[PDB]
Amino acid sequence: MAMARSISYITSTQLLPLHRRPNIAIIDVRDEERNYDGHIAGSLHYASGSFDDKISHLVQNVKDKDTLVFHSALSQVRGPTCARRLVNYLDEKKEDTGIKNIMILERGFNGWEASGKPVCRCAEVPCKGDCA
Ligand SMILES: [Zn+2]
């Protein structure tokens, strides 16, 4: 009942009605190497030494088709922080949002970490969306 107007999270099913196409990707920030501590799937984690040199980078590579999901887990608390930095860059430039549509994942990888063994293991490089 009125809860889907850009800049919002989507439930497991909410992903069905949309599922635009590969144009979607999940952004994460913390260090990447310090977050996984092993392997992983989907969503790419990045630094934050600039906080603005990462969204100009994404803005420069909008690729036209672009859907962005932030956090990678379930916005347990950092989600708002994700938007916080979004504001930081947008503050540096203005009306940034290199992404066509920004939303937050309902599951991300909370089930895997929380109730799906520690973290992805395997022994490959391109294993899953993002495995470090
Ligand atoms: Zn893996």
XYZ file of N, CA and C and ligand atoms in Angstrom:
397
model
N 0.840 -1.227 0.000
C 0.000 0.000 0.000
C 0.862 1.259 0.000
N 1.231 1.717 -1.191
C 2.056 2.910 -1.326
C 3.396 2.732 -0.625
N 4.324 2.058 -1.295
C 5.648 1.816 -0.733
C 6.632 1.392 -1.819
N 6.473 1.955 -3.012
C 7.350 1.635 -4.131
C 7.430 2.796 -5.115
N 8.270 3.776 -4.798
C 8.440 4.945 -5.653
C 9.905 5.369 -5.708
N 10.747 4.501 -6.262
C 12.173 4.784 -6.371
C 12.793 4.969 -4.991
N 14.093 4.712 -4.883
C 14.792 4.853 -3.610
C 14.112 4.023 -2.531
N 13.852 2.758 -2.842
C 13.178 1.877 -1.882
C 13.638 0.424 -1.998
N 13.326 -0.361 -0.969
C 13.688 -1.785 -0.935
C 12.632 -2.640 -1.617
N 13.049 -3.802 -2.106
C 12.130 -4.718 -2.773
C 12.189 -6.102 -2.140
N 11.023 -6.695 -1.897
C 10.969 -8.023 -1.296
C 11.322 -9.089 -2.328
N 11.523 -10.322 -1.866
C 11.869 -11.429 -2.759
C 10.974 -11.427 -3.994
N 9.678 -11.267 -3.763
C 8.701 -11.233 -4.845
C 8.721 -9.900 -5.563
N 8.939 -8.817 -4.824
C 8.961 -7.491 -5.433
C 9.990 -7.457 -6.556
N 10.941 -8.381 -6.499
C 11.961 -8.485 -7.522
C 11.387 -9.108 -8.796
N 10.320 -9.912 -8.661
C 9.725 -10.563 -9.831
C 9.071 -9.556 -10.788
N 8.159 -8.703 -10.287
C 7.468 -7.707 -11.116
C 8.421 -6.767 -11.845
N 9.604 -6.548 -11.275
C 10.578 -5.662 -11.889
C 11.595 -6.455 -12.698
N 12.672 -6.885 -12.040
C 13.728 -7.647 -12.701
C 14.003 -7.075 -14.086
N 14.316 -5.784 -14.109
C 14.598 -5.068 -15.348
C 15.476 -5.901 -16.268
N 16.654 -6.247 -15.757
C 17.648 -7.051 -16.479
C 19.033 -6.790 -15.867
N 20.125 -7.331 -16.449
C 21.484 -7.139 -15.909
C 21.809 -5.690 -15.527
N 20.976 -4.742 -15.955
C 21.185 -3.333 -15.631
C 21.261 -3.106 -14.118
N 20.947 -4.134 -13.326
C 20.967 -3.999 -11.871
C 22.240 -4.579 -11.250
N 22.707 -3.906 -10.199
C 23.898 -4.309 -9.459
C 23.842 -3.722 -8.053
N 24.416 -4.420 -7.079
C 24.385 -3.945 -5.696
C 25.723 -3.359 -5.249
N 25.683 -2.120 -4.756
C 26.879 -1.445 -4.276
C 27.038 -1.598 -2.765
N 28.276 -1.821 -2.345
C 28.607 -1.958 -0.935
C 29.893 -1.195 -0.641
N 30.067 -0.761 0.599
C 31.259 -0.010 0.973
C 31.691 -0.312 2.406
N 32.984 -0.587 2.582
C 33.534 -0.888 3.902
C 35.028 -1.211 3.827
N 35.450 -1.823 2.714
C 36.849 -2.209 2.494
C 36.921 -3.388 1.524
N 35.812 -4.120 1.403
C 35.727 -5.277 0.515
C 36.469 -6.480 1.102
N 37.762 -6.324 1.349
C 38.565 -7.409 1.901
C 38.224 -7.677 3.365
N 37.816 -6.635 4.083
C 37.481 -6.770 5.498
C 36.041 -7.235 5.716
N 35.199 -7.110 4.693
C 33.799 -7.502 4.820
C 33.592 -8.995 4.577
N 34.102 -9.485 3.456
C 33.945 -10.892 3.091
C 34.630 -11.829 4.080
N 35.922 -11.617 4.302
C 36.683 -12.476 5.204
C 36.684 -13.916 4.682
N 36.439 -14.060 3.379
C 36.403 -15.370 2.748
C 35.960 -15.271 1.300
N 34.730 -15.690 1.019
C 34.185 -15.610 -0.328
C 32.813 -14.959 -0.255
N 32.141 -14.817 -1.386
C 30.821 -14.199 -1.381
C 30.106 -14.339 -2.723
N 28.947 -13.702 -2.802
C 28.108 -13.715 -4.000
C 27.445 -12.355 -4.233
N 27.276 -11.965 -5.492
C 26.657 -10.689 -5.815
C 27.148 -9.517 -4.978
N 26.768 -8.321 -5.410
C 27.132 -7.083 -4.717
C 28.644 -6.898 -4.625
N 29.109 -5.704 -4.984
C 30.533 -5.389 -4.943
C 30.836 -4.334 -3.880
N 31.730 -4.671 -2.951
C 32.115 -3.756 -1.880
C 33.296 -2.892 -2.312
N 33.331 -1.652 -1.834
C 34.410 -0.739 -2.182
C 34.826 0.123 -0.988
N 35.951 0.811 -1.145
C 36.497 1.678 -0.105
C 35.586 2.867 0.184
N 36.164 3.899 0.794
C 35.430 5.110 1.131
C 36.387 6.216 1.555
N 37.609 6.161 1.033
C 38.597 7.174 1.350
C 38.247 8.505 0.722
N 37.431 8.453 -0.326
C 36.999 9.650 -1.026
C 35.500 9.862 -0.840
N 34.717 8.809 -1.087
C 33.260 8.875 -0.953
C 32.636 9.630 -2.108
N 33.470 10.310 -2.858
C 33.014 11.088 -3.993
C 33.709 10.651 -5.273
N 34.863 10.018 -5.132
C 35.604 9.549 -6.286
C 35.072 8.197 -6.743
N 34.036 7.698 -6.062
C 33.467 6.401 -6.413
C 32.155 6.542 -7.184
N 31.446 7.642 -6.960
C 30.171 7.868 -7.629
C 30.331 8.666 -8.930
N 31.503 9.274 -9.128
C 31.787 10.019 -10.366
C 32.245 9.012 -11.372
N 32.751 7.980 -10.776
C 33.261 6.825 -11.428
C 32.094 6.011 -11.970
N 31.048 5.916 -11.151
C 29.839 5.208 -11.534
C 28.998 6.100 -12.439
N 29.084 7.411 -12.208
C 28.357 8.376 -13.017
C 28.949 8.410 -14.423
N 30.268 8.266 -14.492
C 30.971 8.262 -15.768
C 30.695 6.967 -16.522
N 30.345 5.916 -15.783
C 30.060 4.624 -16.388
C 28.620 4.192 -16.111
N 27.685 5.128 -16.260
C 26.271 4.840 -16.034
C 25.800 3.697 -16.926
N 26.397 3.599 -18.108
C 26.046 2.551 -19.062
C 24.583 2.645 -19.487
N 23.962 3.798 -19.249
C 22.560 4.001 -19.608
C 21.659 3.110 -18.757
N 21.786 1.802 -18.950
C 21.007 0.832 -18.192
C 21.657 0.604 -16.838
N 21.030 1.108 -15.781
C 21.603 0.961 -14.450
C 20.584 1.034 -13.314
N 20.528 -0.057 -12.563
C 19.699 -0.183 -11.370
C 20.670 -0.471 -10.227
N 20.579 0.243 -9.118
C 21.527 0.025 -8.033
C 20.849 -0.316 -6.718
N 21.322 -1.390 -6.096
C 20.826 -1.821 -4.800
C 21.948 -1.631 -3.796
N 21.698 -0.932 -2.700
C 22.780 -0.684 -1.748
C 22.723 -1.591 -0.529
N 23.901 -1.780 0.079
C 24.067 -2.611 1.284
C 24.570 -4.012 0.941
N 23.709 -4.819 0.309
C 24.045 -6.198 -0.082
C 23.491 -7.212 0.916
N 23.038 -6.730 2.069
C 22.485 -7.609 3.094
C 20.991 -7.357 3.290
N 20.649 -6.353 4.093
C 19.249 -6.033 4.345
C 19.108 -4.702 5.081
N 19.986 -3.752 4.760
C 19.958 -2.432 5.389
C 19.728 -2.539 6.895
N 20.453 -3.450 7.535
C 20.330 -3.657 8.975
C 20.522 -2.350 9.740
N 21.226 -1.402 9.125
C 21.485 -0.107 9.751
C 22.335 0.789 8.853
N 23.177 0.169 8.032
C 24.057 0.906 7.130
C 23.315 1.435 5.909
N 22.210 0.788 5.529
C 21.444 1.241 4.370
C 21.372 2.757 4.293
N 20.829 3.403 5.341
C 20.734 4.859 5.399
C 22.102 5.487 5.191
N 23.136 4.798 5.679
C 24.502 5.267 5.516
C 24.868 5.252 4.038
N 24.363 4.235 3.331
C 24.606 4.096 1.902
C 24.095 5.331 1.187
N 22.892 5.746 1.563
C 22.294 6.936 0.982
C 23.015 8.176 1.480
N 23.557 8.094 2.693
C 24.288 9.209 3.274
C 25.447 9.598 2.369
N 26.229 8.603 1.950
C 27.354 8.866 1.066
C 26.846 9.253 -0.321
N 25.686 8.718 -0.710
C 25.115 9.083 -1.997
C 24.911 10.590 -2.006
N 24.442 11.091 -0.869
C 24.223 12.513 -0.673
C 25.546 13.273 -0.684
N 26.598 12.658 -0.128
C 27.907 13.307 -0.074
C 28.398 13.653 -1.468
N 28.361 12.684 -2.375
C 28.801 12.945 -3.738
C 27.837 13.902 -4.413
N 26.542 13.619 -4.301
C 25.541 14.483 -4.903
C 25.752 15.912 -4.408
N 26.269 16.021 -3.187
C 26.565 17.310 -2.585
C 27.747 17.956 -3.296
N 28.728 17.130 -3.655
C 29.921 17.609 -4.341
C 29.583 18.103 -5.742
N 28.656 17.416 -6.399
C 28.249 17.786 -7.748
C 26.839 18.367 -7.760
N 25.840 17.485 -7.612
C 24.416 17.865 -7.602
C 23.624 16.959 -8.543
N 22.478 16.473 -8.071
C 21.627 15.596 -8.870
C 22.440 14.471 -9.503
N 23.437 13.992 -8.769
C 24.302 12.922 -9.251
C 23.487 11.694 -9.672
N 23.320 10.743 -8.750
C 22.577 9.511 -9.019
C 22.854 8.976 -10.417
N 24.058 8.463 -10.615
C 24.413 7.899 -11.899
C 23.553 6.700 -12.237
N 22.810 6.235 -11.242
C 21.933 5.077 -11.403
C 20.546 5.481 -11.866
N 19.977 4.649 -12.718
C 18.643 4.889 -13.247
C 17.588 4.693 -12.162
N 17.846 3.757 -11.250
C 16.911 3.475 -10.165
C 17.629 2.910 -8.945
N 17.450 3.552 -7.791
C 18.096 3.094 -6.562
C 17.101 2.442 -5.593
N 17.442 1.228 -5.182
C 16.625 0.450 -4.267
C 17.517 -0.314 -3.287
N 16.914 -0.918 -2.266
C 17.687 -1.686 -1.297
C 17.192 -3.135 -1.244
N 18.141 -4.066 -1.131
C 17.825 -5.492 -1.108
C 17.191 -5.922 0.209
N 16.179 -6.773 0.092
C 15.462 -7.291 1.247
C 16.221 -8.456 1.868
N 16.878 -9.240 1.021
C 17.634 -10.397 1.478
C 19.134 -10.175 1.331
N 19.552 -9.693 0.164
C 20.968 -9.459 -0.069
C 21.782 -10.726 0.113
N 22.257 -10.939 1.334
C 23.042 -12.125 1.668
C 22.947 -12.422 3.167
N 21.902 -11.890 3.800
C 21.688 -12.083 5.226
C 21.392 -13.540 5.538
N 20.630 -14.188 4.670
C 20.306 -15.580 4.881
C 21.528 -16.466 4.774
N 22.409 -16.147 3.828
C 23.624 -16.929 3.634
C 24.562 -16.790 4.825
N 24.865 -15.557 5.211
C 25.748 -15.329 6.344
C 25.091 -15.783 7.649
N 23.868 -15.305 7.863
C 23.095 -15.602 9.069
C 22.651 -17.063 9.192
N 22.041 -17.612 8.142
C 21.542 -18.989 8.206
C 21.936 -19.818 6.988
N 23.073 -19.500 6.397
C 23.540 -20.248 5.244
C 25.036 -20.448 5.290
N 25.510 -21.062 6.369
C 26.935 -21.277 6.552
C 27.619 -19.921 6.672
N 28.821 -19.859 7.265
C 29.542 -18.596 7.424
C 29.426 -17.706 6.176
N 30.394 -17.788 5.275
C 30.372 -17.002 4.048
C 30.856 -17.852 2.877
N 30.364 -17.575 1.663
C 30.753 -18.358 0.484
C 32.183 -18.877 0.618
N 32.408 -20.115 0.187
C 33.730 -20.729 0.289
C 34.342 -20.944 -1.094
N 33.952 -22.033 -1.755
C 34.455 -22.352 -3.090
C 35.966 -22.132 -3.187
N 36.469 -22.025 -4.415
C 37.892 -21.809 -4.641
C 38.140 -21.221 -6.026
N 37.185 -20.429 -6.506
C 37.298 -19.806 -7.820
C 37.469 -18.296 -7.694
N 37.604 -17.629 -8.836
C 37.774 -16.178 -8.858
C 36.459 -15.469 -9.173
N 35.799 -15.829 -10.292
C 34.536 -15.219 -10.692
C 33.323 -15.919 -10.082
N 33.558 -16.708 -9.034
C 32.485 -17.434 -8.364
C 31.365 -16.490 -7.933
N 30.157 -16.743 -8.427
C 29.006 -15.939 -8.073
C 29.186 -14.490 -8.481
N 28.142 -13.709 -8.246
C 28.185 -12.292 -8.556
C 29.447 -11.661 -8.012
N 29.597 -11.669 -6.686
C 30.790 -11.139 -6.072
C 31.212 -12.029 -4.912
N 32.393 -12.607 -5.069
C 32.982 -13.492 -4.079
C 34.359 -12.982 -3.664
N 34.531 -11.662 -3.686
C 35.806 -11.040 -3.327
C 36.789 -11.106 -4.491
Zn 32.417 -18.589 -3.654
